[PDB]
Amino acid sequence: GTSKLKYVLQDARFFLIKSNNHENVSLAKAKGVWSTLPVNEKKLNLAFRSARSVILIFSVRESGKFQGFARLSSESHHGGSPIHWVLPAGMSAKMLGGVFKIDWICRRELPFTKSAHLTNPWNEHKPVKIGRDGQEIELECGTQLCLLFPPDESIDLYQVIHKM
Ligand SMILES: CNC(=O)c1cccnc1
């Protein structure tokens, strides 16, 4: 069903998260973590304190798809177990901010062709697939985008709801 999913997304904030490669999304899916540049780290930390759920919607550049979505479970922190991200050419690990813990809500993909009817008011009402890394997606567009993903029957949102 979709009811617990709608409950998790109620009054959420949503952010488009870009990855240069599939490897980093695979790491994020396996380890429940993400790390971004300080400019976006600061925005996500502010958002985490502001809303009952903050949703990251992931897209690998040039893939033509979203690879899933997850909810922040923490503000960023430093000093944890290192993560061997594959970073863009010319980027060292020290250029990243801290590490956010995330709980995956859907690990299934969604092709951009399926979201062509959704526009993001916070990016000039351009199609929601369009945006820089860290672009916020307004509530209604973000909710509808998440509801387009195929249901992920491997995930139980009971555990997510309790963290809220
Ligand atoms: C795992 N994180 C990354 O790959 C990245 C790279 C540049 C900017 N933001 C995030």
Swiss-Prot record:
Tyrosine phosphorylated. Residues 12-149 form the YTH domain. It is found in: Nucleus; Nucleus speckle. Changing R132F: Reduced binding affinity for N6-methyladenosine (m6A)-containing RNAs by 9-fold. GO terms for cellular component: nuclear speck; nucleoplasm; nucleus; plasma membrane. The modification Phosphoserine is found at S81, S92. Changing R132A: Reduced binding affinity for N6-methyladenosine (m6A)-containing RNAs by 100-fold. It comes from the Eukaryota. Changing S19A: Does not affect ability to influence alternative splice site selection. GO terms for biological process: dosage compensation by inactivation of X chromosome; in utero embryonic development; mRNA alternative polyadenylation; mRNA export from nucleus; mRNA splice site recognition; mRNA splicing, via spliceosome; post-transcriptional regulation of gene expression; primary follicle stage. Changing L56E: Does not affect ability to influence alternative splice site selection. Regulator of alternative splicing that specifically recognizes and binds N6-methyladenosine (m6A)-containing RNAs. M6A is a modification present at internal sites of mRNAs and some non-coding RNAs and plays a role in the efficiency of mRNA splicing, processing and stability. Acts as a key regulator of exon-inclusion or exon-skipping during alternative splicing via interaction with mRNA splicing factors SRSF3 and SRSF10. The YTH domain mediates RNA-binding. This is YTH domain-containing protein 1. It comes from Homo sapiens. The gene is YTHDC1.
